[PDB]
Symmetry: C4
Subunit: 56 residues, 4 copies
């Protein structure tokens, strides 16, 4: 083994570690973005509340 297969293999492993870390970052931001769905539901309630007061 090597000559020098081992060094190349290590480099591949180092790259794989970097991509996975990237994935973790991509997932954190998706989770934060998902909170948007609740906010845009809130806007629709806020508009309905306006409609209720105006009717009154």
């Amino acid at each position: 083994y090597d000559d020098e297969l081992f060094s190349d293999v290590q480099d591949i492993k180092t790259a794989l570690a970097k991509i996975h870390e990237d994935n973790q970052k991509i997932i954190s931001k998706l989770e934060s973005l998902l909170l948007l769905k609740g906010e845009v539901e809130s806007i629709k309630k806020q508009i309905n509340r306006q409609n209720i007061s105006i009717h009154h």
Copy 2:
């Protein structure tokens, strides 16, 4: 095919399979986010509905 070399190759295969699984999770979340699109359009209509009510008053 040195045994240690095979061990190392198996590790690489294990890493890639994990990355692919993460990709599935990422795509699943994106599909959910896409539904936002319909929700926003509905808000524009809700405002238009409001405008009509105000005119008829």
Copy 3:
């Protein structure tokens, strides 16, 4: 170049191609999502038009 080693190397290449394919799908979805920013700005204008409507009475 051992025959089994070559096959495992081939298996690795197939996996990278699949991950790359996942990437393109992810990018496509994110481009669609970015269209949201224009839609939200449009809502801000639509609400402002209502305000102009109310002032004129």
Copy 4:
């Protein structure tokens, strides 16, 4: 270290570099999307302002 095997290893490296490059772009797009959080918040305030004007208006 067989020369054919070396090419195949180089090929693997090239694909990984390309995937990382894609990862960067995906991240840049997510950061842009995040600014949406502020925009949706701006709308919530804009609606509240209407309610206040209306109260003074009425």
